[PDB]
Amino acid sequence: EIRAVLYNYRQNQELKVRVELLHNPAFCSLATTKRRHQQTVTIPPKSS
Amino acid sequence: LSVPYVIVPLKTGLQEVEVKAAVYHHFISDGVRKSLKVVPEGIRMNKT
Amino acid sequence: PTEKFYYIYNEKGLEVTITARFLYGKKVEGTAFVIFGIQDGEQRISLPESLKRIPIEDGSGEVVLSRKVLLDGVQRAEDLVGKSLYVSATVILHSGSDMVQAERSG
Amino acid sequence: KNTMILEICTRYRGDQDATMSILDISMMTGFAPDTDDLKQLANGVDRYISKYELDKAFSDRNTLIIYLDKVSHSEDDCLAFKVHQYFNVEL
Amino acid sequence: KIVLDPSGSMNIYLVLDGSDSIGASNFTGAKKCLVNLIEKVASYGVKPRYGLVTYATYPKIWVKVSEADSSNADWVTKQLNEINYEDHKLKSGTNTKKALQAVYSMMSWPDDVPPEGWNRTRHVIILMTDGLHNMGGDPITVIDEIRDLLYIGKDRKNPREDYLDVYVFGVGPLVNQVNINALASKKDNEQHVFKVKDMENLEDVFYQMIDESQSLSLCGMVWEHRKGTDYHKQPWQAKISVIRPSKGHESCMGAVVSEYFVLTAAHCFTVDDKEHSIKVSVGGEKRDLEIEVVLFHPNYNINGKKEAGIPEFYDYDVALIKLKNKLKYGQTIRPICLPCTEGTTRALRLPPTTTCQQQKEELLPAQDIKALFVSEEEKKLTRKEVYIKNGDKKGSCERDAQYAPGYDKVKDISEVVTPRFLCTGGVSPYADPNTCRGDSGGPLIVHKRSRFIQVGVISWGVVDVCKNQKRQKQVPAHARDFHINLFQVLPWLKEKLQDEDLGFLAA
Amino acid sequence: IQPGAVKVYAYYNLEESCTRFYHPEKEDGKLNKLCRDELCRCAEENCFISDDKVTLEERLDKACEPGVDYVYKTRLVKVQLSNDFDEYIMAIEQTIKSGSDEVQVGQQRTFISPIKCREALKLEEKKHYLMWGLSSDFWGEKPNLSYIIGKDTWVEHWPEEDECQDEENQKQCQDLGAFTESMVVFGCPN
Amino acid sequence: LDEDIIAEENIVSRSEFPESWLWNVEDLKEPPKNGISTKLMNIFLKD
Amino acid sequence: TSLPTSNEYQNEKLANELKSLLDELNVNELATGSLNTYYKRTIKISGQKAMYALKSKDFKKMSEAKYQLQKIYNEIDEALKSKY
Numbered sequence A: 001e002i003r004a005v006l007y008n009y010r011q012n013q014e015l016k017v018r019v020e021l022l023h024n025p026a027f028c029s030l031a032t033t034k035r036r037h038q039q040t041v042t043i044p045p046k047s048s
Numbered sequence B: 001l002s003v004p005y006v007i008v009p010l011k012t013g014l015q016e017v018e019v020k021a022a023v024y025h026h027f028i029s030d031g032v033r034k035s036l037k038v039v040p041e042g043i044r045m046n047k048t
Numbered sequence C: 001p002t003e004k005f006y007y008i009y010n011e012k013g014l015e016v017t018i019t020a021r022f023l024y025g026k027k028v029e030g031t032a033f034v035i036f037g038i039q040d041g042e043q044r045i046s047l048p049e050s051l052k053r054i055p056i057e058d059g060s061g062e063v064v065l066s067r068k069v070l071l072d073g074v075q076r077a078e079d080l081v082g083k084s085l086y087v088s089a090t091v092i093l094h095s096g097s098d099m100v101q102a103e104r105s106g
Numbered sequence D: 001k002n003t004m005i006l007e008i009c010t011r012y013r014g015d016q017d018a019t020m021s022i023l024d025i026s027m028m029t030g031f032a033p034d035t036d037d038l039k040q041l042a043n044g045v046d047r048y049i050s051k052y053e054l055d056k057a058f059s060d061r062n063t064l065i066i067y068l069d070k071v072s073h074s075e076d077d078c079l080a081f082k083v084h085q086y087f088n089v090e091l
Numbered sequence E: 001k002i003v004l005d006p007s008g009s010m011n012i013y014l015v016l017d018g019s020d021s022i023g024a025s026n027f028t029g030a031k032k033c034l035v036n037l038i039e040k041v042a043s044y045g046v047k048p049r050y051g052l053v054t055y056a057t058y059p060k061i062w063v064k065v066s067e068a069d070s071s072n073a074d075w076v077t078k079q080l081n082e083i084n085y086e087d088h089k090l091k092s093g094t095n096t097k098k099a100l101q102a103v104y105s106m107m108s109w110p111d112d113v114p115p116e117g118w119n120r121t122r123h124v125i126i127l128m129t130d131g132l133h134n135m136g137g138d139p140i141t142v143i144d145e146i147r148d149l150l151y152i153g154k155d156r157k158n159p160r161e162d163y164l165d166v167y168v169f170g171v172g173p174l175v176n177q178v179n180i181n182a183l184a185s186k187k188d189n190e191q192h193v194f195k196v197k198d199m200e201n202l203e204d205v206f207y208q209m210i211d212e213s214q215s216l217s218l219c220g221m222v223w224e225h226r227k228g229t230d231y232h233k234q235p236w237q238a239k240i241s242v243i244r245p246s247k248g249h250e251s252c253m254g255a256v257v258s259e260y261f262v263l264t265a266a267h268c269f270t271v272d273d274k275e276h277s278i279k280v281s282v283g284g285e286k287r288d289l290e291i292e293v294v295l296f297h298p299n300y301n302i303n304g305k306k307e308a309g310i311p312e313f314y315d316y317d318v319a320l321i322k323l324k325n326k327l328k329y330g331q332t333i334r335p336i337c338l339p340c341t342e343g344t345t346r347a348l349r350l351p352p353t354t355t356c357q358q359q360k361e362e363l364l365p366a367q368d369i370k371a372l373f374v375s376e377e378e379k380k381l382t383r384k385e386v387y388i389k390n391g392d393k394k395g396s397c398e399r400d401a402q403y404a405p406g407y408d409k410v411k412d413i414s415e416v417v418t419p420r421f422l423c424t425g426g427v428s429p430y431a432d433p434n435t436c437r438g439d440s441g442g443p444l445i446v447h448k449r450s451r452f453i454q455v456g457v458i459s460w461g462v463v464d465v466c467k468n469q470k471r472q473k474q475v476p477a478h479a480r481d482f483h484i485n486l487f488q489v490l491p492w493l494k495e496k497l498q499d500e501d502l503g504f505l506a507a
Numbered sequence F: 001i002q003p004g005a006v007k008v009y010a011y012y013n014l015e016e017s018c019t020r021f022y023h024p025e026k027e028d029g030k031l032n033k034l035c036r037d038e039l040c041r042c043a044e045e046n047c048f049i050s051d052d053k054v055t056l057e058e059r060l061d062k063a064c065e066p067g068v069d070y071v072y073k074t075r076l077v078k079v080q081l082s083n084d085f086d087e088y089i090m091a092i093e094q095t096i097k098s099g100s101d102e103v104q105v106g107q108q109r110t111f112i113s114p115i116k117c118r119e120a121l122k123l124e125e126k127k128h129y130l131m132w133g134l135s136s137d138f139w140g141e142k143p144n145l146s147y148i149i150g151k152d153t154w155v156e157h158w159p160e161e162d163e164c165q166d167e168e169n170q171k172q173c174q175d176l177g178a179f180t181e182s183m184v185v186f187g188c189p190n
Numbered sequence G: 001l002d003e004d005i006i007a008e009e010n011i012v013s014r015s016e017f018p019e020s021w022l023w024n025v026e027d028l029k030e031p032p033k034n035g036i037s038t039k040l041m042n043i044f045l046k047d
Numbered sequence H: 001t002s003l004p005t006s007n008e009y010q011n012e013k014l015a016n017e018l019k020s021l022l023d024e025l026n027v028n029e030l031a032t033g034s035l036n037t038y039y040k041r042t043i044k045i046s047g048q049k050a051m052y053a054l055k056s057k058d059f060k061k062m063s064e065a066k067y068q069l070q071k072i073y074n075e076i077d078e079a080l081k082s083k084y
Ligand SMILES: *[C@@H]1O[C@H](CO)[C@@H](O[C@@H]2O[C@H](CO)[C@@H](O[C@@H]3O[C@H](CO[C@@H]4O[C@H](CO)[C@@H](O)[C@H](O)[C@@H]4O)[C@@H](O)[C@H](O)[C@@H]3O)[C@H](O)[C@H]2NC(C)=O)[C@H](O)[C@H]1NC(C)=O
Pocket: B046
């Protein structure tokens, strides 16, 4: 398992983030050539 | 940005001029309520 | 002024910088009216031929008093030695709303 | 909705009871630990969950950290907490 | 803003608009915002000469500020409550100038003679209109006329702006705000303009229009506004802590009975515990206060029954705690009322001839009494309403003490449950909540007349339904709570709190 | 549109400056204002003036509006006229609705109107009129006030006693008469 | 009202424009540390 | 029915959290009647920003107004503790 920390250092604006892991034939994940493995999380202000 | 305003004092004494302004889309505003002295028509003198 | 004095044999002349900024710190944009003159104990002699009108960009301005005009202000450079020069600036915003008069003397 | 149960059992392969260890947990995309269950495991001795991790609510808590004061080397120290689905997404 | 004290007479001129622009939905709600006021005003003890005038095109004087009944809130409320909207439906006009014109006479003394110390009287006009007035001129001039009558704003160093508080409630939908403000009093750092929405959550409204300058001392008084912290609701409440070797930390509670004293259970401490091992936390501030001495009740003894088989004896389980520093009463730090005192007398609004026995009857009648005890849940002071089994069920409730730990092999129940005890909890007549270990020493209060009177002190219980940091699930029917009746230890509280200037009844 | 302005002055002296205005219509930028002696007002406003369908209901509504302050049945006694504004000294014969002005029946309250409104209502002498306006039309300081016949001023001709007999003025005599009683004892419907 | 802006009735104008304020007097009787007392004042900045 | 989706949750949660503050808006707004003009000026402005953001259901404006309205609340809470 690899970590991907998304930092948000805005004053008072929680961010609606869309993170995606690009596909790569060298690795085997949920993301394939025709399928995108993308989440849609939210990050509180001045936090990660 | 300067904004002109033509006015005509009617009564003497410490009167009150008030202007307000708000921006569209942005939720900001600021009003100013300063006071100016309204003196009649006379000239200083010191008769002996 | 670049120097806190003036060298009589200085070709460049008396260089003066006009700095104008709002009370809240922000820089000022406008036009300034700067003049010079010589002082003698209590008497002042204005120099009409030194009147300049320099723009004020980025809250800064640059004005110079050429030695040529200075000497022409009187009628013996070594004589002016001991006297003093005074600068009188007057900045006016591009909005023509406010006006300030500054002055450096001595 | 679906609400499942996550049970974790561990043991130290040493002669002595391992000291203070850490439990790094990663939820299944669309699952958040039950708040109430976390309080229970927190108040319990030999276990600790920082206040920072507590008041996060179902939303942002995909990663959990349960600090342990010790782990037995004889038998297995097992704990369990409830998890709820709030996101629903295929695969 | 609105001085509040019997040290001077006051006046409340209630003017209400009853024209068509108000409507039945807001006129009825306009009365509620005057009825509840009188109650919260009388709860402070002050006795204002109420004036009530409903107006439209021609006002209708219900109550005059000169009558002898203008000081009986119970009657003024009756009148206001009986005031039917459609009293005048013919003249839907809104002549406000005329209404205030009548109010002028209320304070307009009879001719060339200023009454006894007239100027010391406060004047408060509470007009409830929608600003939309058709008939008459501008009611502003009236405010300027009254401005002179009360000799206000007519002197240099003596403005007298403290004797005129004009409040305006914008009732009805479409309301001319511009007009209202002009009428309302213009004072700095004060509020006099209230609108429709303000109605909901009335407590918040009353807050602004009240300053307890001289009622900073009144006991059992509580603010209920939503913007109030836990201690704004329970000022008397106090959190006591006992630190000692191998003792971890003992958690108990108490109630501020005086400037220097705090009442709590006597079983929370011991002769061994020192005075610097006990810290009292009053309200909110995590600033512990050093105590001076713990006054245990002379009759207290938890080991008095080393022979009979009663490991723990909770009889006379009361102890006062004199703080090392004097407390200054605030919105979050106020005393609670104690039985058989001058405070409780005026708190219950009873004649000066009220005896100690009459209070015990009103507070603790032979029946099911509505009581309550303050408890903390996750650092939150929540109120728990319970019932006192003082009636016939008193026996059925007290006999459940045979289930208590170390209370099985007991000769007699009247040996462990002394008359010094009140009984609560159970499932009759209602499912009463239970007290936990942390709540020990908590006050047993009887909410009456908007005031709070303490009549008991949490001593012990039968079942610990409050396991550990929790409480609920499956509570036994014999889960009873016992509290030390403050009437049974009167002579003691009457002895220690003698110099606290409380005013105990010599009777 | 707002009148422009041009200011001239030396760089060394701001006090000694001169400023002129300019407007495509108005004199020289100077706004419109009515003034007498040393008492001027913001006359920057409109005027006030074929008998559509004035009924008993059309009046009860416009006579119970917000600004509605005063309502009188007056009789014009004297008519003076100046080069900068006219006026009418009318005596109140009854106070249908008392306003901010404490006036008893019989006294005279001065009314003022622009010289351009001489064609509005030719207020003849010794004739009755029903009028009502706003409190913002008051002019001067109490007790010496003065009414202003502005845009919100209602001026109507009140027929005489022996004029309601005419079979053409009856429709108005009954409306005015009913409007009177509907105001003195009853009041506005709001 | 529905516009993405603030109405006139919701704009509280700034009026307090003093040229010189905070003409107060404070004594330093606080617990001294290294001969240097420290008082924390909560002032109300003008408009 | 089963469950929400991507923008189906976070966008609703923020809406609820913003509404919770808007409910007790009149409570805080009326609480500045005794406080200074600053609090009365800040809350009447931060008030609309929260309402307009709610109806728009815009994640950005709702959050932007949530802390805008939350800050002023806290500043009022502290402004009262100096008054008891
Ligand atoms: C009573 O009345 C008199 C007359 O009005 C007032 O006297 C005037 O008051 C002011 C303040 O004292 C004086 O201002 C001063 O002006 C001087 C001199 O004027 C100068 O003249 C020389 C030579 O021409 C030049 O420098 C200039 O032309 C300049 O005008 C100036 O040097 C000072 O800087 C100062 O400002 C003014 O002079 C004076 N006017 C007169 C005397 O006519 C007086 O204030 C008033 N009050 C009382 C009770 O005495």
